[PDB]
Amino acid sequence: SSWWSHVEMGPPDPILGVTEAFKRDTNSKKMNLGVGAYRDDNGKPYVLNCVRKAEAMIAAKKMDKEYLPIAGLADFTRASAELALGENSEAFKSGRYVTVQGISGTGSLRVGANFLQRFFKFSRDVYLPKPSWGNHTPIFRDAGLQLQAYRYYDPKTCSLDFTGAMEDISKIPEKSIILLHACAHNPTGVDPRQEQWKELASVVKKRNLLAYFDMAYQGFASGDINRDAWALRHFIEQGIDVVLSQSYAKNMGLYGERAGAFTVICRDAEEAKRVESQLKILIRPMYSNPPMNGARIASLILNTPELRKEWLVEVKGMADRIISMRTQLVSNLKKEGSSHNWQHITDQIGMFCFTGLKPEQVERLTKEFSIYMTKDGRISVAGVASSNVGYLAHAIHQVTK
Amino acid sequence: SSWWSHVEMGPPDPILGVTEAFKRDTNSKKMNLGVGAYRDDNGKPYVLNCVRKAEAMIAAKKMDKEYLPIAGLADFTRASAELALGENSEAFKSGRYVTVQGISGTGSLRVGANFLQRFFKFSRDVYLPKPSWGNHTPIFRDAGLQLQAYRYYDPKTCSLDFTGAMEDISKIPEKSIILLHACAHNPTGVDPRQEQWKELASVVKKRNLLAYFDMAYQGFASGDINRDAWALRHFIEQGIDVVLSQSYAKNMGLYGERAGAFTVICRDAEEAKRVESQLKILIRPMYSNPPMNGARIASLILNTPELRKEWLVEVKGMADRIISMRTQLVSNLKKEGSSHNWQHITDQIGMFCFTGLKPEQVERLTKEFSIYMTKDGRISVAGVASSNVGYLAHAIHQVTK
Ligand SMILES: *Cc1c(COP(=O)(O)O)cnc(C)c1O
Ligand SMILES: *Cc1c(COP(=O)(O)O)cnc(C)c1O
């Protein structure tokens, strides 16, 4: 009998553990549609070009490796707030925001969670949309908050349940926290139309809720970064002081680099200062300071007009591919004789597809064809290459027939 | 009013805050002897040659940026354990340990605290040496643990108070946590001798305390990495099953790249596997997975013989440097005419010198000479160059005369 005799075996991450499994699989035909990481046309990891170039400018600049400030690389911090809020943004232009660099979107979400935990004085309840990215839960629960939920996706409709979203939402108690995905709702793939966003926002405003936006796929909803930040900025423009999480993980394909940020909309520029100090005091004992290379790469591209332009064309290309994949997806599905409706594959947006597959359906795909995905029938459509759209289709069909 | 209208403006970090201040001083002659960050003889940031080399092989390797597993890069992982534990290590050879990559030393300390709080049931109190590094307090506190202390440094004599320490230690309640700095006690720069270390082991074994080692300067106290891990290793062979934190921040001079690790020694390999599960379960909702740049490098060096060799020679060279500065500093103080004994300057090991100066004196250094240090009068020795060594000397003379 010792120290850790009592600790039991925990399970494998529902998302992340798929990669694990994936890697152990000897079938050469294997695919990992678990997590959402973009592959190019040959099924390979794709490092954007502007990333490479920036990588190089850093190298050639022979920079040091001294510590970052707690809040991160200023230059990155600011570029992020602009990318998000928009250059013409009041809130932006008047200095009422604070943004600290974080450990990508997860770390960002968390300090955000912990900040709410420590200062938000009116409630410990956080309302998540049904369903929501799995990590949401543990991020908020480990932070000290309790979780609630508001209806969002209708499975018989394979579309948003706006009505229910609004009934639920309209009944959330005044001054509660509501997690809203900025765009590219993980895992549904469905987001509200402007008209509906416009609507939600009135109730948030109306019920005086703290709105927490998580923006991990800016650019991926449509391929247009500003058309994707519409919602967020709207809200803010109606007078809703939100909080936000951002990740350059997917859109810059800096996955393991860890680049994200957390921002808080304040009243003044004075409040902003005040809050930052606290943010910092939250962080020091967390990780001391952030990992620098990701932000360097990113800060360089955001702030270098050339780099920036190329980036944006690369992002558009990414989106485009995926789209082609959906399209190819369903057509082969028919080509294969599938009596089922597969329009969802084409109507949804972002990096996945919320297939509808049942967990048995799910297993069979892993087992028989080594196609790896999540228990919720959620597939990374972004990890499918041209050469494998066809196999996916067969498998799916085979599983679904 | 406002969500945050009550958020108070907090104070700058006791250590990390001097750098901020430092950056604002316009005197050409400033020196940042605050944080323990090494500079070459010209007072310039020193990126190790083996560091420079490893980055070159990664770029040349044209590697990807995909996510790393939760615990991190296995090679990095395996390596630090070894680095720490030793290769002839039994616990290492058997695989009774679990190492997870972390966000340098802090994030390691922090996950370790977070693990303790979750699973260590036999206590809620962590015993810190007096004094300890500043960050330790908040790390544990923020983590939900209770803080205690044992005597360590006697300031009257400016030496370790082995007696008190031992009194304090022997009466720690059974099965509590005691934090011990593996080497290079920060800020004291005063470590137990091998015979005291052998005493200490004896009682922790006896009271049957949980030993948390903080190991940040492996290689900087003695100039020899193996020599620096003697006690860690000592305790282990004595059957004390430890928890340990690593920083590659100083010794690999990888500061802002954030590389480090946390490791818990377990009874079996079986059990380690169970902890590892848990450990990962803790990290995901924290920052999902660690930054990858720093680990690639580190693992590249620790795992490539040439690289490892030169690193050892690089670290030893670093260590000798600081000994030169120490010495020079005192003899310069003599020549300037300082009435006092400045023996501790040469007695203390690691990057620093715990000078014994008073607040006023330090205030005077910053103000008049622009020399920046911690209000407890702890100077960064590793921060002085051949070229500014006199300045400091004169300063310290004028403020102390
Ligand atoms: C990817 C993602 C995030 C952030 O992930 P990181 O890799 O840590 O940047 C946050 N939310 C959702 C819904 C995501 O899909
Ligand atoms: C520097 C140091 C650490 C680790 O520093 P990081 O920047 O987090 O890597 C841990 N403990 C002590 C006592 C230190 O001096």
From Swiss-Prot, chains A, B:
Tissue: Detected in heart (at protein level).
Coiled coil: none
Cofactor(s), names only, from the UniProt record: pyridoxal 5'-phosphate
Keywords: Aminotransferase, Mitochondrion, Pyridoxal phosphate, Transferase, Transit peptide
Pfam families: Aminotran_1_2
Chain sites annotated for binding substrate: G36, W133, N186, R378
Enzymatic reactions: L-aspartate + 2-oxoglutarate = oxaloacetate + L-glutamate; L-kynurenine + 2-oxoglutarate = kynurenate + L-glutamate + H2O
One MF term in the entry's GO annotations: L-aspartate:2-oxoglutarate aminotransferase activity
Family: Belongs to the class-I pyridoxal-phosphate-dependent aminotransferase family.
Subunit text: Homodimer.
Other comments on record: In eukaryotes there are cytoplasmic, mitochondrial and chloroplastic isozymes.
Official protein name in the record: Aspartate aminotransferase, mitochondrial
